[PDB]
Swiss-Prot record, chains A, B:
Family: Belongs to the LysR transcriptional regulatory family.
Domain HTH lysR-type intervals: 1-59
Origin organism lineage: Bacteria, Pseudomonadati, Pseudomonadota, Gammaproteobacteria, Enterobacterales
Compartments where located: Cytoplasm
Protein name: HTH-type transcriptional regulator MetR
Role: Control of the last step in methionine biosynthesis; MetR is a positive activator of the metA, metE and metH genes. MetR is also a negative regulator of its own expression. Binds homocysteine as an inducer.
Location of the DNA-binding region in this protein: 19-38
Length: 88, 88
């Protein structure tokens, strides 16, 4: 199942361009990041990015979930900022 | 930090009306659900629903995150349905 951490990690793959560079940004190891994705791909039933691809390419399902991330993550951020607004 | 499971659980509190009824829906115990929320409230820095309240009342921060859930969860659902569409 898709979690918020998977959506941010998908953004790191696009923003950093490789599994190793994104792992360095997310303070994780490269294998642990690869293990998290294949673990997610197994439960979802489809792959998120092209295996062995260099440069790394997303699958159509990965592009869909990346666009999902670009939409949900700013909304969660704005919601938590409103929760911490000096009011209510 | 807000997770997808926290957003669905917030919807269960509104849809079921109590911590005990929502726990039965989510296949969790009542204390484990209460432990998950106070755990989340501790890290966020604010409370999500009024303590001891009967009937259960959300705080203003809980209403904000509930409206967040009503917006994000359908988008995640539509994204996964598109991923499983017989195409791509
Ligand atoms: Mg993988
Ligand atoms: Mg609590």
């Amino acid at each position: 199942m898709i979690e918020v951490k998977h959506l941010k990690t998908l953004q790191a793959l696009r923003n950093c361009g490789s599994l190793a560079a994104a792992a360095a940004t997310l303070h994780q190891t490269q294998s642990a990041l690869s293990h998290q994705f294949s673990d997610l791909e197994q439960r979802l039933g489809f792959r998120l990015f092209v295996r062995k691809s260099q440069p790394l390419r997303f699958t159509p399902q990965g592009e869909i979930l990346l666009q999902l991330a670009n939409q949900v993550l700013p909304q969660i951020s704005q919601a938590l900022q409103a929760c911490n607004e000096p009011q209510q």
